[PDB]
From a paper:
We identified multiple mAbs from antibody phage display library made from COVID-19 patients and further characterized the R3P1-E4 clone, which effectively suppressed SARS-CoV-2 infection and rescued the lethal phenotype in mice infected with SARS-CoV-2.
Both the heavy and light chains of R3P1-E4 bound to the RBD protein through the residues extensively overlapped with the binding sites for hACE2. These interaction regions covered all the RBM of SARS-CoV-2 S protein, which is critical for binding to hACE2 during viral entry. Furthermore, we found close contact interactions of K417 of RBD with multiple residues of R3P1-E4 antibody including the Y33, Y52, S100 and E101 of heavy chain and N231 of light chain. These interactions may explain why B.1.351 and P.1 variants, which respectively carry K417N and K417T mutations, were selectively more resistant to R3P1-E4 antibody as compared to WT, B.1.1.7 and B.1.617 strains. More importantly, by introducing E101Q mutation in the heavy chain, we found the engineered R3P1-E4 antibody had improved binding and neutralization activity to both B.1.351 and P.1 variants.
Author numbering:
A (entry chain A): 2 to 117, 141 to 244
B (entry chain B): 335 to 389, 395 to 515
């Protein structure tokens, strides 16, 4: 059950480029496939969903230029990128969207493309000693009930689901990771920072289009 | 436990004129490390699916940014024609990542070279490490540098300030 995605490289502005993303354990036409990019210096940014039934959506800053599609024959999601510009420089991940029932739990590896309701998170940056207890917060402008997830992304590696549905822990995640909240305020607690836990953490709303918060970075 | 990570994480890569083929045999390794280090600016697989890998040649060289597109089936240019040719029916995967921080230096790094002058295009997977004075003119060179008598190699001059297409990229080609 992987997502291996392929293709990228450089391209001068105006050019076009077609990312792909082949899956193994999941069926591409049966899931909500989606693309997220992280601009250098910025945080995670949703690009475009494709529904199992064929509907397609995109973020404002790419609509008309990008075209998500898939080929059921070879089980592969594609992202068709035309009229590219410098702001489209980012690491481009493909992710399976379980939505409100599981977040984006299965991510591909990045493919660096090099062109030549507000979610809030606090702290923006925090240092903590190993074995400390760390609580980061996330805030919603409109009440989203408990429909919100958390992800760790360590520098260079693809993101990773932690909590979805405000409090449900993703299978395969250390028990020290825990989370609570409903309405507009949400928290993630790490009970005892172990050295691997040093990364940046986002929240995301699981109702709307995927909308990630700014991100809180943990470090020493 | 194949040494894929000896190729990738070599502390030094080579030049495209003199690329290194490392034959891997007597082993079994997953190609997990390819699709698990998200930090590759390019990963293309031809003739195969990159999921269907786990159920024999590693070639490593350094080129600049806007010519990694040449390290692919059917592409042509100063690299595909005279340095590293890859056939039109390739069965393998092309892996490339920016190496600015490692193959560049202030005032320019002229340690990586490529073949500028060659009379005919290379055959696929062919290699040419010849240093014979290329005759451009009508007069014989007798192996002596000068006018119309050129050392067929050329330095990259990788500087950190270079534009992104002129930055050094490390390329790994796994042919099956």
């Amino acid at each position: 059950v992987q997502l291996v995605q392929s293709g990228g490289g450089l391209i001068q502005p105006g050019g076009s480029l077609r990312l792909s993303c082949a899956a193994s354990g999941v069926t591409v036409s049966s899931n909500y496939m989606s693309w997220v990019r992280q601009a250098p210096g910025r945080g995670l940014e949703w690009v475009s969903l494709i529904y199992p039934g064929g509907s397609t959506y995109y973020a404002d800053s790419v609509k008309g230029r990008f075209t998500i599609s898939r080929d059921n024959s070879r089980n592969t999601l594609y992202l068709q990128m035309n009229s590219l510009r410098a702001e489209d420089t980012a690491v481009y991940y493909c992710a399976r969207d379980l939505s409100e029932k599981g977040g984006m739990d299965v991510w591909g590896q990045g493919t660096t493309v090099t062109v030549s309701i507000v979610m809030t998170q606090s702290p923006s940056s925090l240092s903590a000693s190993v074995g400390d207890r760390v609580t980061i917060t996330c805030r919603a402008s409109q009440g989203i009930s408990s429909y919100l997830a958390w992800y760790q992304q360590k520098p260079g590696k693809a993101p990773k689901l932690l909590i979805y549905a405000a409090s449900t822990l993703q299978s395969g995640v250390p028990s020290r990771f825990s989370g609570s909240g409903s309405g507009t305020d949400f928290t993630l607690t790490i009970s005892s920072l172990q050295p691997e836990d040093f990364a940046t953490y986002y929240c995301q709303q699981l109702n709307s289009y995927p909308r990630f918060g700014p991100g809180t970075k943990v470090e020493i | 436990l194949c040494p894929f990570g000896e190729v990738f994480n070599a502390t030094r890569f080579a030049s495209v004129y003199a690329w290194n083929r490392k034959r891997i045999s007597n082993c079994v390794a997953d190609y997990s490390v390819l699709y698990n280090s998200a930090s590759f600016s390019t990963f293309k697989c031809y003739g195969v699916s990159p999921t269907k890998l786990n159920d024999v040649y590693a070639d490593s060289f350094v080129i600049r940014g806007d010519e990694v597109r040449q390290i692919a089936p059917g592409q042509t240019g100063k690299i595909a024609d005279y340095n590293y040719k890859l056939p039109d029916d390739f069965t393998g995967c092309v892996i490339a990542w920016n190496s600015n921080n490692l193959d560049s230096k202030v005032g320019g790094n002229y340690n990586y070279l490529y073949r500028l002058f060659r009379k005919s295009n290379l055959k696929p997977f062919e290699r040419d490490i010849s240093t014979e004075i290329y005759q451009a003119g009508s007069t014989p060179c007798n192996g002596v540098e000068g006018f119309n008598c050129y050392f067929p190699l050329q330095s990259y001059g990788f500087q950190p300030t270079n534009g992104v297409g002129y930055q050094p990229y490390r390329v790994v080609v796994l042919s099956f």
